[PDB]
Amino acid sequence: SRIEREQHHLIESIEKSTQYMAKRRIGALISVARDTGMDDYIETGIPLNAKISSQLLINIFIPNTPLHDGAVIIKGNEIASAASYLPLSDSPFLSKELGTRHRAALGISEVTDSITIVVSEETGGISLTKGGELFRDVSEEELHKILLKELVT
Ligand SMILES: Nc1ncnc2[nH]cnc12
Ligand SMILES: [Cl-]
Numbered sequence: 001s002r003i004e005r006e007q008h009h010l011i012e013s014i015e016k017s018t019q020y021m022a023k024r025r026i027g028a029l030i031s032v033a034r035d036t037g038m039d040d041y042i043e044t045g046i047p048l049n050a051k052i053s054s055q056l057l058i059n060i061f062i063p064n065t066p067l068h069d070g071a072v073i074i075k076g077n078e079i080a081s082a083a084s085y086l087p088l089s090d091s092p093f094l095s096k097e098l099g100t101r102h103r104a105a106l107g108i109s110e111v112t113d114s115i116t117i118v119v120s121e122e123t124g125g126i127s128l129t130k131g132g133e134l135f136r137d138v139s140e141e142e143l144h145k146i147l148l149k150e151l152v153t
């Protein structure tokens, strides 16, 4: 259909779902594929090939459920997979206060141009990784501007 409409709906869906999870300290890990493919990491998860919504993203990460333990990977206009493996960064610069989801988000950002969003189950803070860099505990305004810049062409 109309790509700009799809891209803005994707941004809204990430914003609403991460707001919901952040308030409840639900851990989450959502990686959005870009020019470089993520197909090999999609293959490690449970296939969904589903329409993007804030509601599905939230339902996926509910603790102690079949789909929660790993990354969601979004490819084109679909939630491709849940519970996917991402490579862990070995960087010693990542703070030891951060958990596996952050190290996974950092790891995938070091080998793809994907944009990955994390919700910390410890703090509720929202972080983002891109190109081997971490943007830690961003405000709602900051998250919106980054997602606009990176996900809207
Ligand atoms: N908990 C985790 N979530 C996603 N990718 C991972 N790779 C290793 N541990 C992981
Ligand atoms: Cl069209």
Ligand SMILES: [Cl-]
Pocket: 027, 099, 100, 101, 102, 119, 120, 121, 122
């Ligand atoms: Cl966490």
